[PDB]
Amino acid sequence: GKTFFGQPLGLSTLFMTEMWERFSYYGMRAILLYYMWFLISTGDLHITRATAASIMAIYASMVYLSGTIGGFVADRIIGARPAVFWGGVLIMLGHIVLALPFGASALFGSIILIIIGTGFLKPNVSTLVGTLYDEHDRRRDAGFSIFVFGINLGAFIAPLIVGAAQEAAGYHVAFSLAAIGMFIGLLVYYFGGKKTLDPHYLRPTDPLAPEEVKPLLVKVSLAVAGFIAIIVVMNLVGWNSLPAYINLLTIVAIAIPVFYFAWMISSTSTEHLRVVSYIPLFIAAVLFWAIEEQGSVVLATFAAERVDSSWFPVSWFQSLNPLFIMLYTPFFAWLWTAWKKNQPSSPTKFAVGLMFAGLSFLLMAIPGALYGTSGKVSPLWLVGSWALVILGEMLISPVGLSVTTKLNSQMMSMWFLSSSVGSALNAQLVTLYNAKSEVAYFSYFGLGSVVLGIVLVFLSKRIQGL
Ligand SMILES: CCCCCCC/C=C\CCCCCC(=O)OC[C@@H](O)CO
Ligand SMILES: CCCCCCC/C=C\CCCCCC(=O)OC[C@@H](O)CO
Ligand SMILES: CCCCCCC/C=C\CCCCCC(=O)OC[C@@H](O)CO
Ligand SMILES: CCCCCCC/C=C\CCCCCC(=O)OC[C@@H](O)CO
Ligand SMILES: CCCCCCC/C=C\CCCCCC(=O)OC[C@@H](O)CO
Ligand SMILES: CCCCCCC/C=C\CCCCCC(=O)OC[C@@H](O)CO
Ligand SMILES: CCCCCCC/C=C\CCCCCC(=O)OC[C@@H](O)CO
Ligand SMILES: CCCCCCC/C=C\CCCCCC(=O)OC[C@@H](O)CO
Ligand SMILES: CCCCCCC/C=C\CCCCCC(=O)OC[C@@H](O)CO
Ligand SMILES: CCCCCCC/C=C\CCCCCC(=O)OC[C@@H](O)CO
Ligand SMILES: CCCCCCC/C=C\CCCCCC(=O)OC[C@@H](O)CO
Ligand SMILES: CCCCCCC/C=C\CCCCCC(=O)OC[C@@H](O)CO
Ligand SMILES: CCCCCCC/C=C\CCCCCC(=O)OC[C@@H](O)CO
Secondary structure (H helix, E strand, O other): OOOOOOOHHHHHHHHHHHHHHHHHHHHHHHHHHHHHHHHHHHOOOOHHHHHHHHHHHHHHHHHHHHHHHHHHHHHHHOHHHHHHHHHHHHHHHHHHHHHHHHHHHHHHHHHHHHHHHHHHHHHHHHHHHHHHOOOOOOOOHHHHHHHHHHHHHHHHHHHHHHHHHHHHHOOHHHHHHHHHHHHHHHHHHHHHHHHOOOHHHOOOOOOOOHHHHHHHHHHHOOOOOHOOOOHHHHOOOOOOHHHHHHHHHHHHHHHHHHHHHHHHHOOOOHHHHHHHHHHHHHHHHHHHHHHHHHOOHHHHHHHHHHHHHOOOOHHHHHHHHHHOOOOOHHHHHHHHHHHHOOOOHHHHHHHHHHHHHHHHHHHHHHHHHOOOOOOOOOHHHHHHHHHHHHHHHHHHHHHHHHHHHHHHHHHHHHHHHHHHHHHHHHHHHHHHHOOOOHHHHHHHHHHHHHHHHHHHHOOOOOHHHO
16 A cells, blocks of 8 residues: 555655664764864864874774674664664764864764764664565565665765855854754654554564573673773873874774684685685775775865865765765666676676775876876866765675675674774774875875775686685
């Protein structure tokens, strides 16, 4: 009868829920870097612009890492529906914290709230989408495709609205708009959810058995103690600068997949050989996400310093990324179906995807080389870059989780960890970007990325077999 684009009505609630949460997230991202610059310019915030960029990168990295944990907490301890709700409350608080007349002092509280909040909400709204379908219901793919379109929608309009607001009424009003975005999300989620969602997901679906509670408690406490202990030693030997902490978070984010790789490989020999073949794919994913995650940092810097954008808010460039996702998506949907005969392998898609990413940086090296780096250049250079990298994303992401799974639960999380690892790498790399290094930065990381894409093409055939 009455459906939401063919799908159960309950999909409309989750569609809107995520649309507004993503609105709140990307509205904030579009101006947070400029906000840190602002706070630097007034002497309120005592860091370099390069450190500000580094913060942006490690922030994303922690958001993605947080998300690989929220599923477990909801499944085992609090339930999917409460996770989404309190996750949204924490996200809203994080934005409210930035709307207050405080300054640089609120930055950390804001960041922690949103890292925890997002990590609760984000995997669990996906989970709730799945629960709308019987599991042999073929509509499922369509429904997720629709859900994703809502995600891209929020990411698309947020910089336009929040950025304009920032221009009209300043940073605190613009951040309050992100808060209101999340609030709307919660409103629709709460009341819409009660009508359409199974009450079963009010509770955990795999609750802790009595003998499971102690070891989990022991597990968590040790990790905290260690982490605290590392921070203590760090300060005793004088490694207590913001860059040092960012470095520590970088190490933790890299170590997690490195430890997992070291585990599987050490610990079925043919099962082993498939795991070793994934390492090239994982590296490729990491490098790809790095370049893509620099849209909000390095391309954002470029947009503000090198582009003549005197007639519109420079944060609007952050809308090109989800615009191109939305434009490309129904195309590539049609493409794979039409292309039945000799479809490229998922490892081949990874390689070519990395090349396009690499091309997107190589493109950006041209205006500096041709025109110099002291003037301003056309907005279209950036438009071409995002067009190139998102073309890369269409090849890598839709097959990404697929390639990892067919090659367990730790490996499954490893795909979602590639975007965290890429951002952690960025936290180091983006500090190398400035006006003097511009052309070398784009060239080097552009070319290297294309080369590794070439290497992966050579390696593609053996991985296909496995
Ligand atoms: C395991 C789940 C996630 C674990 C991540 C732990 C979160 C810890 C720190 C979050 C990153 C904050 C770094 C940025 C920062 O320090 O900004 C504050 C700075 O402006 C103060 O001057
Ligand atoms: C400030 C958030 C606006 C949302 C509308 C207000 C919600 C009503 C009461 C708030 C306190 C309890 C919230 C309900 C809750 O804990 O979880 C609801 C969620 O689990 C799905 O029904
Ligand atoms: C249930 C609570 C969720 C509602 C969202 C809360 C955010 C709404 C309004 C906050 C207004 C903050 C902006 C006021 C402000 O300080 O403007 C700064 C101004 O002096 C500079 O132009
Ligand atoms: C990757 C794992 C991270 C998860 C962090 C979870 C927080 C750590 C400890 C909280 C223990 C929760 C106790 C849950 C509970 O009340 O269940 C007890 C009951 O089910 C026993 O019959
Ligand atoms: C499963 C997680 C494993 C994590 C491994 C533990 C990390 C051990 C040591 C981290 C070193 C501290 C971070 C580096 C650092 O502070 O250097 C920056 C400093 O030199 C600048 O002042
Ligand atoms: C169509 C989607 C709207 C939102 C997308 C993000 C828009 C941000 C930047 C786009 C500006 C590029 C437009 C090309 C252009 O303005 O021509 C060059 C111009 O400088 C000549 O005056
Ligand atoms: C339908 C697919 C279109 C694919 C287009 C492939 C990309 C071709 C060329 C990209 C290189 C940038 C062009 C160099 C350039 O325009 O610089 C000069 C410019 O400033 C105008 O004088
Ligand atoms: C298919 C779409 C087109 C892809 C565009 C790829 C552009 C290819 C190469 C761009 C690299 C330009 C590097 C210029 C350069 O390194 O000059 C350095 C120095 O001589 C000037 O600073
Ligand atoms: C795959 C088929 C393509 C055939 C070759 C295409 C090569 C396209 C561009 C090459 C890079 C341009 C030259 C780099 C440059 O301008 O600076 C280098 C030179 O100034 C010394 O640093
Ligand atoms: C692949 C199709 C598009 C072709 C893209 C090739 C563009 C590669 C390099 C273009 C940069 C031209 C200017 C670089 C340059 O010569 O500056 C260095 C030196 O000559 C100036 O002092
Ligand atoms: C499969 C086909 C994908 C279509 C993508 C087409 C666009 C991809 C690359 C084009 C990059 C060119 C951007 C450089 C440029 O346009 O010059 C800017 C400026 O000179 C215009 O005034
Ligand atoms: C294989 C997976 C990890 C690959 C990335 C590892 C890090 C790679 C290079 C780090 C050094 C960057 C080289 C210097 C650079 O390109 O910056 C531009 C330069 O002009 C400013 O120093
Ligand atoms: C301008 C300088 C670069 C020349 C451009 C042309 C390069 C094209 C291919 C390079 C050699 C790749 C060999 C093909 C190959 O073995 O990989 C294909 C893969 O399907 C099976 O191995």
